[PDB]
Design a protein around this ligand. Structure first.
Ligand code: SAH
Ligand code: NA
Lengths: 243, 6
């Protein structure tokens, strides 16, 4: 009967597979890593065609029972390209929206930062880092002023949130690019397979975090190639002294 | 590399 297929990050696809063993049907769901928030509806071979926001209320004999959320929030597989970040740049991720918000950073002169909405435990996925997909060659050969929000995805791809999409008034489908740097972070970047964004990275807590605590990540620039923006070099000197 | 987390 029903099958659950988990990703390493804890998200899953669940439903009755078809005669070919594929996640294809009108009652398939992607379930986020809270094992509660779900996108339920039409999938073809595990690709989300029309996922409606739902809550996983219970399971019976392994079968998930959902309640659809009010409204008509629907989502589809919408992987970015080199030039298009999203078909719905202003449509937030529903899992992320209940976990983080953007506000002025507590770090001096650091602009906006990303904050926890609620108290969470260690190993909790908080936020998604989606962006356009460009090459290391393009990124490495341009000035640092353009590389504020670049995140390496793999050996071939860098994810970027370029102007003006680094303003939430123009892009808020994901918010991972809003987390500031710390050499003593409370989060890490981790691999994530998202039903809307595809293979991206996420921000995951490494320890318990309180409500309204700023989320920080080590940006992990090369210290001995330091190939890094000036503010990072300045704080690296500071960090190294406390050691 | 001019990107994070490489
Ligand atoms: N520890 C730190 N100190 C100073 N500036 C920081 C910082 N961590 C991040 N930043 C700033 O944040 C940018 C990366 S994007 C992070 C979100 C950004 N503060 C925003 O308002 O959208 C960097 O270019 C730098 O301007
Ligand atoms: Na799950």
């Amino acid at each position: 009967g029903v099958c659950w297929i988990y990703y390493p990050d804890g998200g899953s696809l669940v439903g009755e597979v078809n005669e070919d063993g594929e996640m294809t049907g009108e009652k398939i769901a992607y379930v986020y890593p809270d094992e509660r928030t779900a996108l339920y509806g039409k999938f073809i071979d595990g690709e989300m065609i029309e996922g409606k926001l739902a809550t996983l209320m219970s399971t019976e004999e392994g079968r998930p029972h959902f309640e659809l959320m009010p409204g008509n929030s629907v989502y589809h597989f919408d992987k970015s390209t080199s030039s298009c970040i999203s078909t719905n740049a202003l449509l937030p991720d529903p899992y992320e929206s209940e976990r983080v918000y953007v506000a002025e950073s507590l770090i001096s002169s650091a602009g906006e930062g990303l904050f926890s909405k609620v108290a969470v435990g260690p190993n909790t996925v908080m936020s998604f880092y989606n962006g356009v997909r460009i090459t290391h060659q393009e990124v490495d050969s341009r000035d640092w002023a353009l590389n504020g929000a670049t995140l390496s995805l793999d050996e071939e791809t860098v994810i970027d949130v370029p102007e003006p999409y680094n303003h939430v008034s123009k892009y808020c489908a994901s918010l991972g690019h809003k987390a500031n740097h710390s050499f003593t972070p409370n989060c890490i970047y981790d691999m994530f397979v998202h039903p809307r964004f595809g293979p991206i990275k996420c921000i995951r807590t490494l320890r318990a975090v309180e409500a309204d605590e700023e989320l920080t990540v080590a940006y992990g620039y090369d210290h001995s190639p330091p190939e890094a923006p000036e503010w990072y070099q300045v704080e690296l000197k500071a960090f190294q002294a406390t050691q | 590399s001019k990107s994070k987390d490489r």
